[PDB]
Structure 1
Amino acid sequence: SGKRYPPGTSLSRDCNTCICRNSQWICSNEECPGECLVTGQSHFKSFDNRYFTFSGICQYLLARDCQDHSFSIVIETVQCADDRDAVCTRSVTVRLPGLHNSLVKLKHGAGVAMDGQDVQLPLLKGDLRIQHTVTASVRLSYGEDLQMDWDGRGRLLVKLSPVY
């Protein structure tokens, strides 16, 4: 990145580490977690660090486990202003077939609703934990291989560990 480092150093990306030896960084190729990101009006980021935009108004499928069926996430888009080029996220629906085949729903506030029932946070069930983060944003955590973020005003995130 346009600056010099002595030999033997070990700078670390978020993903892994690299060490200087004979003017050539040696680097590991071990996987590191991805992050699909919804934000703004309609701006998506794939797990593979692709960026794009799709201003559709329906219930779209954001993510899903597709060899087995440990979960499935479903975004719900609506127009969000006077203009037609303004399509923000209103809610997201999560589905856990591992526990009751339940159906979590993150609402346009910081609210959550399991199977129609509004819920006070925290929600320690067996696997999934739902709690506030700054007391202004919800955070789902199923197991140790799944996280989420607030879908109040539309800034959904995910954290998928390399087991997926």
Structure 2
Amino acid sequence: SHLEVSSLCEEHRMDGCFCPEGTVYDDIGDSGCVPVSQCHCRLHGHLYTPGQEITNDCEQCVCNAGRWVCKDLPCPGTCALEGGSHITTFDGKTYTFHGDCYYVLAKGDHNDSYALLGELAPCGSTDKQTCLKTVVLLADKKKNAV
């Protein structure tokens, strides 16, 4: 797992039980100085054999010699507008706003495609007590308003 240790080795040499010329020591399993292309991977527990694929969040990965070789899969993205004022963007990034207007939440860049609005106005007493009130969708070349 920790390969290439000897490039940062600030110790002199002594006696003890070691490995041969190649044949790195098995850390993840329990055996001895196994060859490098028999290193079992691991992923929160399970001892994956070298060649067992797995389907993760947005990528699929295969256990190569000790390391994972991962390849991307298509997965969507979700913007959320929760509470009165808690925006979570498509890329993480949660923030608090407390507005009073119509605001452009998402719109297509080309010339037309769509535009999603949303009213974030005060609902309580002060200005810091805001609420979502109206969602407006401008679709089908911006000629249909929902």
What's the TM-score bracket when you normalise by the shorter of the two chains? 0.5 to 0.7
TM-score, with normalisation over the residues of structure 2? Answer: 0.61
**Which one has a bigger Cα radius of gyration?**
2
CA deviations 1:4-62 (Å, max 9, x no partner) are 43133333233221222222111113442111111112111111122111111110000
Task: Give the corresponding residue for 1:87.
Answer: 130
Task: Give the corresponding residue for 1:48.
Answer: 91
**Runs (4+) off by over 6 Å:** none
Pairing 1:3–2:45 present: yes
The structure with more helix, counted as a fraction of residues:
2
| RMSD of Structure 2 on Structure 1 (CA) | 2.1
CA deviations 1:86-110 (Å, max 9, x no partner) are 2121111001134x71101xxxxxx
Identity %: 28
Pairing 1:14–2:57 present: yes
TM-score, with normalisation over the residues of structure 1? Answer: 0.55
Residues 60 and 19 of structure 1: is their aligned pair in 2 closer, same or farther, counting only changes over 3 Å? same
Per the TM alignment, residue 3 of structure 1 is displaced from its structure 2 partner at its CA by 2.7
Mapping for residues 6-155 of structure 1, pairs under 5 Å: 6-7=48-49, 8-98=51-141, 101-104=143-146
Q: Is the 8 A contact 2:59 2:71 kept in 1?
A: yes
Gaps of 5+ in 2: 1-42
CA deviations 1:124-143 (Å, max 9, x no partner) are xxxxxxxxxxxxxxxxxxxx
